[PDB]
Amino acid sequence: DANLKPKNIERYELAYSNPQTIEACYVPPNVDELYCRFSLRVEANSMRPY
Amino acid sequence: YGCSFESSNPLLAIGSLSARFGALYWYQQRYLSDHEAVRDDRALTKAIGHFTAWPDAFWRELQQMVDDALVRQTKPLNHTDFVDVFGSVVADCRQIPMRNTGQNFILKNLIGFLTDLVARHPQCRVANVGDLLLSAVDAATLLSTSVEQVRRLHHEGFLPLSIRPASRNTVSPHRAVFHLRHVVELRQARMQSHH
DSSP states (O other): OOOOOOOOOGGGGSOOOOOEEEEOOOOOTTOOOOOOOOOOOOOSSSSSOO | OOOOSOOSTTTTSSSOOHHHHHHHHHHHHHHSSSSSOOTTTTTHHHHHGGGGGGGHHHHHHHHHHHHHHHHHOOOOOGGHHHHHTTTTTGGGGGSSOOSSSSTTTTHHHHHHHHHHHHHEEEESOOOTTOOOOOHHHHHHHTTTSSSHHHHHHTTTSSSSOSSOOOOSOOOOOEEEEEHHHHHHHHHHOOOOOOO
């Protein structure tokens, strides 16, 4: 509590876990390489105010 | 009025007067349950004979109730309270006022017994006697030390806690929570003295 009083919590009460639900992503076994792709367009559009 | 004894074979025949008084008080509540009839002489007169085979009788009194308790079992033993089997025989050890084992001979024999009981019942898949739960005030008595010392001993990790309490709560001294075999072993391991 505001780095002042440490809270009343009994010793055993912090040995408990905190469960959570998460999403995650891993490369599956035996894949040799991963690919990533995207496209890019460029326009000469700074010459004049929209 | 004095002691003055020699060839004191019985466990009631040695010691300071305060102990000799305490031993009689204990005998009386435990075996003279009959209501006072001011048989002040006769009622107590028998206590000396009683103790003459003590080193070999006390254990049988304790053994008898292990078996009678067992056949009335309703829960697996590892959630059973120590008290449900032995009926507070431990608390009675507090009627003699001395704390150390070499003088309080009633406590000395009770511990002897419990050590042997654990020794013949090692851990396996199904729970058995020896896994019973003790409360904080009980370990204090068996370990010959005050209660606050047990809390300190827990805090340093010298012994495990078996029941998970709820949050924002506290475990009171009367709650049953340590296994018997854990207390017996710890005492042999690090609580001995010249007493």
